[PDB]
Design a protein around this ligand. Structure first.
Ligand SMILES: O=P(O)(O)OC[C@@H](O)[C@@H](O)c1cnc[nH]1
Ligand SMILES: O=P(O)(O)OC[C@@H](O)[C@@H](O)c1cnc[nH]1
Ligand SMILES: O=P(O)(O)OC[C@@H](O)[C@@H](O)c1cnc[nH]1
Ligand SMILES: O=P(O)(O)OC[C@@H](O)[C@@H](O)c1cnc[nH]1
Ligand SMILES: O=P(O)(O)OC[C@@H](O)[C@@H](O)c1cnc[nH]1
Ligand SMILES: O=P(O)(O)OC[C@@H](O)[C@@H](O)c1cnc[nH]1
Ligand SMILES: [Mn+2]
Ligand SMILES: [Mn+2]
Ligand SMILES: [Mn+2]
Ligand SMILES: [Mn+2]
Ligand SMILES: [Mn+2]
Ligand SMILES: [Mn+2]
Ligand SMILES: [Mn+2]
Ligand SMILES: [Mn+2]
Ligand SMILES: [Mn+2]
Ligand SMILES: [Mn+2]
Ligand SMILES: [Mn+2]
Ligand SMILES: [Mn+2]
Ligand SMILES: [Mn+2]
Ligand SMILES: [Mn+2]
Lengths: 191, 191, 191, 191, 191, 191
């Protein structure tokens, strides 16, 4: 009903997105960038989407291109699956506490494409989250939310009220966008 | 059931308000102040009210008196239609992104009359929104929310988190009050 | 179903808590600290809990010990009654206007124990709310929210956006925690 | 062996102190000032003294005189019970965390009478801890430590590294003095 | 006598902790995060615990989850092994110089769960300690001490008085917690 | 058992040190610099060393050379007497109140040579302590602690928390190093 399959094949990467807005958190994400996988799994789960994301890109250079193309593809999927947007809440927002962190997101689904990202501590502009694989530079967080908003054609405002740990600060934001989405996407029993 | 008809006839103006709290956004507003009409149409629509507003006043002087009397009348209608206020959510709030702007409103419907309006950029104290008709001075925004809160006898807190365009800044606030209202006015399945 | 009875007997005090998460605001609180009684009655009521709190302690010293033990016991009750936490909203938040005051609370019920309390004016660190009985020092507000979060094992973020009156500032916070709780505790029709 | 009984009868008050340095925390304190009782019970207990304090004074005026005379008497008892001070550690110190508070105390038992009290937040100069009885003004904390040091004829340095709650800030200090005392008073197996 | 075995199996990780408070520094730690292994080996050794820690987690994402779960499990073990806490010193503290660094830790074992971490230079919020394996982001230090304190249900105050090298700054803190623990955990010959 | 005899013959001075770590404060110090004698007598006594120091140098120039050579020799003695350092506490620290002054010292005996000296008031960089004999310039305090740490091959951190009198400020530091030493040097019943 509200589903979309998006294939995005660029020089730098290969993306397949399968999205059902009216899901139960059946989410599977593999991008070659494990922390990104973790963030997108949280987003799909907490938005109660069913979501598959398969992506392979030029991670030898760094995660940037793959992360960006994936977000673009995902935003495109979101718009398509939304369709005419009639009968929905339209607006949604959510606060996410995560230990010391508090993040917030608000959305207007029928609003024009726009992203405002504020409150993220300055050290996240040069912070790396690294494991045994391809690392994630948190400076990309903004890029993701902008790409997503621009291709879903929605208004997305993401705020960090405060926080210290970069993992918490980032996950809380992704989760906040997710629940904001979940709320806004739901059928509105009055309109 | 939760309806009210208010007629307010002063030296400066003539107002008729017809309000149904449990509506579907059937809204018709004509005050002689087209931007005000636009704001009140948004308020009624996004609050899921059914709302008629017919007003004629001394617009040769400026919109102030008509805008004020209308808000007073509308607040009075809101209180009357609310009645004993039993069984309702009581509290409501809403975030409204509008391009670069983010506005918020929170309400307590059984709280004592009170309005706090904060965060609006200083240039809105002397900004005019002008078209082919009677203009709207944004400095009035505050006046409207205060008049509304005082006559509905509710607690109304309106915030602009940030914003640049005066049209966006104002509409986002009106819309925020609307959805806050809509939430608070709804029947609460537990109380 | 989601109920708990907690008895907490220390050197300083004696506490009995009876808690039903799925209640209708049937609340009875007696701690020897009337303003605390007032705050906890508001918390239980606005959270739509059914709640009994009977407590006797060393109020000759001051309210601190009794207030603290009670909050610990109450948090313990909340955790127990929550049980495995499956099927619930998990996240909740609420804004509470109270005349000039605006307070907010956000919760993550499956999050790790954590409390962040911010925005409370400095004069509440040495303010007393006094009547004909045992007085309440508002500096304790923080202590209460921390104790509650630590023993329910949840993430609790409480904010005062602004305010002047200490009674309003405190009640608005207690009420905000209550509605945040109420939301987060509710069954989620999708998970 | 290291015991002392002190009776101090002034215009303002009546004090009896019974002190055994080599005790097990058998402590009983009654001054008419319940919070003071609580602080002195903690001091005796954590210092592993056996301690009886019976005091009646002019509490209609306020606790000051009684609190002061008691501390003087207690310091006098400490000196007497110490006697020639041979064979002891002489020096002692202790850190006391108490939730958000951290306090410290260091002592030189054979040093000349001296007290330095630092780091206590400014609002404790006008803070009251009040219950159902005679209240305790925290501004007195300093007075107590000075009186104690002057009459035991020792060097006593009390610090608050940080803290917020006045009950915690005060109790942590009393407890810190207690454990510092306990350490310094102990027989030194080398001297 | 004072031992505990804790198994903690989450989505993100698998932890087994074996803890004897009354040990001789027989410590074996393997978490997949070699620097963490180094820190926990120092903690167990300097606390004179006997300690086994076996942990496997989602280090492809980064060390965070594994580090956190391990600390939670370890804190839980500490509490269990502590049992009723009767007859012990209760309080402990230790200074650790490490070349240019000076760190301190103080504990109250019967105090309520609480952690205050202060004095760590700002560049440790975005510093990485990297070798041939999974890296360690020092921003996590705080997270570890908080998790540990919350699950052992103790008061833990960790301070860096000063320091420059992140390895020294971190190890000195872990070692300080260890010796503070060791002291506080010991049988008290007077209580 | 843990003893050392050091003879240090330079152009500027002649030093003989006899050191027993496991002593009873049998101390005799003669350097031609009476205040230095006083400081070293305090150090040996409060460290419970047995210590003989005989030194003659070029005091016509000033005390510097003799004070320095003596400290070097003493540090060398400390290291030698320490030997393999097995079975000892390793870490030690001590607070020394002295009227208005509070000083602290912490040591790591198996740590690499390092000295950090902080908190000493600026006027001690040009202060003289003078009597009927060769004077002592307090600026040398630092030099002494550095020389001592470098030749004993230990980590020595000396702090003045506060103080006014240069005699007190200096003696408190020497005494603090002494008790820190005494603690760290003692046999550890667990390692
Ligand atoms: O909190 P959640 O259960 O949604 O997620 C698991 C959580 O343990 C993990 O994502 C995380 C916790 N702290 C940083 N990352
Ligand atoms: O965004 P809405 O569809 O609620 O409203 C129409 C919108 O295009 C218009 O009100 C507006 C857009 N920017 C300023 N004003
Ligand atoms: O506002 P409520 O009806 O939830 O509560 C009664 C209210 O009148 C009282 O609690 C109060 C009003 N101002 C300070 N305290
Ligand atoms: O922490 P202790 O057990 O020494 O003391 C009891 C404690 O619960 C009480 O004195 C207190 C706790 N917070 C303020 N006062
Ligand atoms: O100082 P210890 O012997 O406890 O630890 C060995 C030490 O050489 C090593 O842990 C280290 C030294 N500097 C940074 N790390
Ligand atoms: O305080 P002690 O007994 O360790 O030392 C004697 C003391 O009287 C003397 O060293 C001194 C006192 N004030 C400055 N110097
Ligand atoms: Mn890009
Ligand atoms: Mn907000
Ligand atoms: Mn995570
Ligand atoms: Mn007007
Ligand atoms: Mn418009
Ligand atoms: Mn407390
Ligand atoms: Mn009230
Ligand atoms: Mn006095
Ligand atoms: Mn207390
Ligand atoms: Mn975490
Ligand atoms: Mn210190
Ligand atoms: Mn190391
Ligand atoms: Mn030199
Ligand atoms: Mn002297």
């Amino acid at each position: 009903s509200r589903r979309a399959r998006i294939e995005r094949r660029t020089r730098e990467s290969d993306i397949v997105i399968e999205l059902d807005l009216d899901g139960t958190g059946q989410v599977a994400v593999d991008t070659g960038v494990p922390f990104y996988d973790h963030m997108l799994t949280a987003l799909g789960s907490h938005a109660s989407f069913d979501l598959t994301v398969r992506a392979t890109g030029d991670v030898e250079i760094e995660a940037h291109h793959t992360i960006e193309d994936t977000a673009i593809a995902l935003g495109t999927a979101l718009g398509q699956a939304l369709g005419d947007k009639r009968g929905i809440r339209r607006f949604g927002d959510a606060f996410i506490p995560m230990d010391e962190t508090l993040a917030h997101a608000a959305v207007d689904l029928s609003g024009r494409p726009y992203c405002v990202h504020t409150g993220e501590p300055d050290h996240l502009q040069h912070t790396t989250i690294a494991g045994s694989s391809v690392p994630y530079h948190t400076v990309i967080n903004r890029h993701v939310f902008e790409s997503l908003a621009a291709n879903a054609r929605i208004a997305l405002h993401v705020r960090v009220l405060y926080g210290r740990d970069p993992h918490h600060i980032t996950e809380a934001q992704y989760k906040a966008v997710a629940r904001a989405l979940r709320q806004a996407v739901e059928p509105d029993p009055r309109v």
